[PDB]
Design a protein around this ligand. Sequence first.
Ligand SMILES: Nc1ncnc2c1ncn2[C@@H]1O[C@H](COP(=O)(O)OP(=O)(O)NP(=O)(O)O)[C@@H](O)[C@H]1O
Lengths: 560, 578
Amino acid sequence: ESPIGVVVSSRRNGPWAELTLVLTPQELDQGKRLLLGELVRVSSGGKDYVGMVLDGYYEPVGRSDPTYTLALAHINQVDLEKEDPWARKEVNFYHHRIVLLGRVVQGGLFAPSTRLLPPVVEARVYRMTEEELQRLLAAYAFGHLAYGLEEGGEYPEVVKEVDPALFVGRRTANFGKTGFGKSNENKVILTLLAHAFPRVGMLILDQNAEYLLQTEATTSPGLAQAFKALGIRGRIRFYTAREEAWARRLKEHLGTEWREYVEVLPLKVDFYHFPELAVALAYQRRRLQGAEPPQYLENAFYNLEDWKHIPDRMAYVYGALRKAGLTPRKGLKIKYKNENYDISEEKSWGNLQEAMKGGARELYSRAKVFSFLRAFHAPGKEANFLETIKEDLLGEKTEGEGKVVILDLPSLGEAADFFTLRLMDLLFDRAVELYGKRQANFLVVLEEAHNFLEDKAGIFYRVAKEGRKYGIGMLYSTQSPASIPMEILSQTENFLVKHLSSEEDVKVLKRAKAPFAFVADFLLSEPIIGYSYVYFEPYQPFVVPLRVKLLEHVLKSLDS
Amino acid sequence: ESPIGVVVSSRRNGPWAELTLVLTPQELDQGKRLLLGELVRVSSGGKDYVGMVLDGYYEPVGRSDPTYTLALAHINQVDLEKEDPWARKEVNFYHHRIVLLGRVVQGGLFAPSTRLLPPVVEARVYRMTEEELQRLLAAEVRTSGSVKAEGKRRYAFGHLAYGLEEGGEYPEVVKEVDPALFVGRRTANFGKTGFGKSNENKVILTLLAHAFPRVGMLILDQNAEYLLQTEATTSPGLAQAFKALGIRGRIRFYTAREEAWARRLKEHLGTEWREYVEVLPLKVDFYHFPELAVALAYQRRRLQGAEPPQYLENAFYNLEDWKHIPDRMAYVYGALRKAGLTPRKGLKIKYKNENYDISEEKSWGNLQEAMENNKGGARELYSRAKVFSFLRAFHAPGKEANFLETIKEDLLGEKTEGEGKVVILDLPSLGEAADFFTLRLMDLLFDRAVELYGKRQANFLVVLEEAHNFLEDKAGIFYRVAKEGRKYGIGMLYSTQSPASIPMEILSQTENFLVKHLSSEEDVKVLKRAKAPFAFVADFLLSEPIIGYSYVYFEPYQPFVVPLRVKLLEHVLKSLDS
DNA sequence: GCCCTTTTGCAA
DNA sequence: TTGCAAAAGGGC
Ligand SMILES: Nc1ncnc2c1ncn2[C@@H]1O[C@H](COP(=O)(O)OP(=O)(O)NP(=O)(O)O)[C@@H](O)[C@H]1O
């Protein structure tokens, strides 16, 4: 209820205003202290500012020689707190430096910095109450305010809550050394969003096989286990090429009713049912590559729909698929001229090949251009998982349904990169096509993003630049700010930063966002696991230190 | 009418003169404060100078220990406002640093900086009044001993402001701009996304349209925000502004979603929207324009390297002569049909002396039979028809428009010369071909503009978004336009959001600058290097993310950079409506 | 990483 | 017989 110290000086140091505070022997003897990085209230001219404690140093006050006095007391062996109160009362001062960050105005908005420097005689500094801190953070907890690991510097009641307005339609970056909590942070945010706001969809690109089932003691549990614990049914769609191994695994950990929580789907299709899909994939593979699809590929890409009415034209497409190595289902009848062959049988295949046009004959001749499709082909599938995912995420059925689509990238081997690029392109094109009718309203979860946001001409770069218009959020983790382009870093809205050991990383971070210049020293020298610095635009344009929650504790606590 | 404080020191710090001001306890207790960046009047030796407040700090005055005094007062709960006047009067001081920018002489001439250093005993500092600020914002550099121009009409662009501080806004002090500044010159609109770029771009375009009705515009609308109000805000677009001002028959909107855009135009402008905007398609019918198809197929190979094939190179140069020979043109039409383009229903091709209808399969088969059962390069073109398949994306039957030629006529036509048209291009609807078509259109517009040098000036303004994407390439048409377009009367207004990515050659020769909040350090550093006057606002621009707050600088005769809160289009329309 | 150089088929 | 495409290795 009273000022902590006395303000004795103030100035403008660069783009910020700073002031000097002095703590007296009485206040120090009452146990009053100020922690570095602590948030305080500054009253000046009838206006309230938020301030941060930056520095602290000892300096003599008045006419005194603290060194001589203390050395003499030590030499003569006098207990300074019991024999010489007046000697103890002339050296027990302490100095602090406080920077003004801005002030809260009108409807919770933040006015940054200031043009008015406060005179010393009329400036006061106050300890901030939990109600004030709660208002500061607010205008399903994910973390709570903390200062380092000091006792008394923890505020379990001051929390930052998850809210779809914070994440959907906006870009979030998750940085930190390996082993410090990026994946746990992501999973806690996603579980809270799924539990509290069930109309938000997620597209998780799982490259390490950890976001569905995770039983080893090296990470937090998976989303399937979290959803089973919280009683969330029928919201996970898992795509994989190991649909039998994963089905076996799910039954040991989710029990006999695992199908109520997870739906396993294959990443394989029958290309004798989707020749247009085969041709489109072969055509797009080269655009995603350097450049210049061939003329015989553009011709097919544009005219295969026309060809479908001509059995002679379609016979050459099926022959190209069969010659590239794709296995047909037993009893597949191909009609040529005035005869029907069974390509599944070697004798009929040879007969038709010997017995065998708008550009389809060139496609048949250059059949080895389809061999890569054999990484996706499986006879008897007839699914088109690309379209299946498209209506999972952007289907008109939703208008708010909630769909967590998890892609098991490793199972695809060396086709995963091409598959990811193609799927992202399709989803973004559909989202653009639906503009003005419905919003996408889903979040792309992207780990090790430095492999996706490198080239400016990439679909992921384009999504990061233009997803806010169409309602697509992005949440990307990289372990190192220096791995991300500065153009993306500067345009990112939300930041969640754990410990970074390198000076270059913190320099890049503060070069991207100025307010991050006040925590670089803490980041460099405090390796604490699960301790985050969070920054949100435009309502919390300043860094706040949060202690993040374990997913196990969150699950055990949300049952109440 | 009294000095704010007392001047205690003066010197020169580099290319500028500076002085030190002290605010005493009596002034500080009356509420007198100086804001950072505020402009003040400095009187010295009978001359008046303009100064700006740069810094502020606390320093002891005389013999006194403020720390000990204030600590002793604090430990006794002494209120240094009603209890210890003597203790308060010994510590209540404050220091400020003020730079001398120049002075106003004669009839508004601005003399920059000064060779005289004011002595400290007779120098006085005064808070500037609104009338003085109004007269100061109108001063500019002039030759010498000459009379002021007495130029054309001027319009309010924004009003003076000093951040977000209370008492820092001066709604009666407005910066008036002559729209001719934007005609034939380069304008840079830097800033973060969502901070006012679109509003000020629309204000500039509306002022140009109202003041100079003979100047045309070519807007490459990437975000689709210049025609109507987007479904995220309610700021009127160019079409609604032109309806409000009663400007008729000037907007030509090219798009591939004519039905949706016509529905929106109806719902927003009423039932007479056709009197204000004309909607045209972006798709061509290549049976009406086989020369366009041949040119596209020929130039696609060239722009990617390697010599084009002989048959394509021959067709490019001889298709106009082939038009008089139906037997030779039938092969071109057959090549298009084989490539797969869809003909308009009822199309007829005359081969030999027989008339066929390629829109029907039986007739098409008959024509194919007759064609094979050396007419220049036409037969070689027909044999290799698969070179035209890529046109299926750009083709639509029954158009007979050729937007590429229509836009060139609109912008550089003799009949349409005068009362310049406002062409707006809906780039998103083009999909992947947007950049290709934009570059082609700009090239074929620059060529015609250079050709017409002597008979008629180009006289149109190019509106480009995310300009760092196109201005990076020094071999590009947009870089060439930025460098050379002034000679042919072609202006450029570009917004980037990342000035560091724009070459210093372009930055140094830009005339108009409007800068909003910039998050990155490199962007601000490049700005300071490019223009010296932007050195006094670098700290503000980096740490003050304020929406609608801009720093403006118009070359070459503006003294210093002016911070403004810019007027909204809604209010500008009312102002022009009175 | 990118820009020549070759064998091979399809045509007319 | 030669021009044109298309895939692939080699030189820079
Ligand atoms: N908030 C937390 N509180 C306590 N321990 C935590 C917290 N977050 C993470 N941990 C511990 O850190 C371990 C690894 O967490 P993890 O989420 O995998 O970090 P990470 O950033 O993803 N490492 P990596 O993905 O390899 O770069 C967990 O198994 C926990 O023991």
